[PDB]
Amino acid sequence: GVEIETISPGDGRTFPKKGQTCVVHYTGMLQNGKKFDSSRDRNKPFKFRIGKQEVIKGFEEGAAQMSLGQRAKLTCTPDVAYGATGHPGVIPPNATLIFDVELLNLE
C-alpha cells in the first residue's frame, strides 16, 4: 500500500510516465528508528527511470502519484520491499518504511 501525504507546493499536473527518467530527492527513515539512506548527503539526486523494476515496489507507485515540485510522504508496507527478506545488515525482515520524497525531475 502506498499512502500519499503531500506537503502542498508544486503543480499537480506533470505526472511521470513510461520511458521517463526522473530525479528524486529521497530521504530514508525507519519507523521508530533512525536514518538508513539519504540522497541529500551524497549530493547526487539519484537519476532513475520508470518501468524497469529498478526501485522497490512502494517507491515505484509513489512517484507516479506525485507531480513536479511536490513533496509527499511515503509509507511502505513490509511485503512490497523487504519484509520477508530484509536487506542484509541494513534493513531487518518485516520492516515498515518511511520516506520524504520531492519530485524535481525532467523528461
UniProtKB/Swiss-Prot annotation:
List the keywords (alphabetical): Cytoplasm, Isomerase, Rotamase, Sarcoplasmic reticulum
Q: Which GO terms describe its biological process?
A: 'de novo' protein folding; calcium-mediated signaling; insulin secretion involved in cellular response to glucose stimulus; negative regulation of calcium-mediated signaling; negative regulation of heart rate; negative regulation of insulin secretion involved in cellular response to glucose stimulus; negative regulation of release of sequestered calcium ion into cytosol; neuronal action potential propagation
Tissues with expression:
Detected in heart muscle (at protein level). Isoform 1 and isoform 2 are ubiquitous with highest levels in brain and thymus.
List the InterPro entries: FKBP-type_PPIase, PPIase_dom_sf, PPIase_FKBP_dom
- What does the activity regulation annotation say? Inhibited by both FK506 and rapamycin.
Where would you find this protein in the cell?
Cytoplasm; Sarcoplasmic reticulum
In short, the EC number is: 5.2.1.8
Q: What is the first-listed, main subcellular location in coarse terms?
A: cytoplasm
Q: Which reaction is this enzyme known to catalyze? A: [protein]-peptidylproline (omega=180) = [protein]-peptidylproline (omega=0)
- GO CC terms in record: calcium channel complex; cytoplasm; membrane; sarcoplasmic reticulum membrane; Z disc
S-S bonds: none
Molecular function as annotated in GO: calcium channel inhibitor activity; calcium channel regulator activity; FK506 binding; peptidyl-prolyl cis-trans isomerase activity; signaling receptor binding; transmembrane transporter binding
Write down the Pfam families for this protein, in alphabetical order.
Answer: FKBP_C
Task: Give the PPIase FKBP-type domain ranges.
Answer: 19-107
What's its job?
Has the potential to contribute to the immunosuppressive and toxic effects of FK506 and rapamycin. PPIases accelerate the folding of proteins. It catalyzes the cis-trans isomerization of proline imidic peptide bonds in oligopeptides.
Query: What is known about its subunit structure?
Result: Identified in a complex composed of RYR2, FKBP1B, PKA catalytic subunit, PRKAR2A, AKAP6, and the protein phosphatases PP2A and PP1. Interacts directly with RYR2.
Can you tell me which family this protein belongs to? Belongs to the FKBP-type PPIase family. FKBP1 subfamily.
In terms of PANTHER family, this protein maps to: PEPTIDYL-PROLYL CIS-TRANS ISOMERASE, PEPTIDYL-PROLYL CIS-TRANS ISOMERASE FKBP1B
This protein is called Peptidyl-prolyl cis-trans isomerase FKBP1B
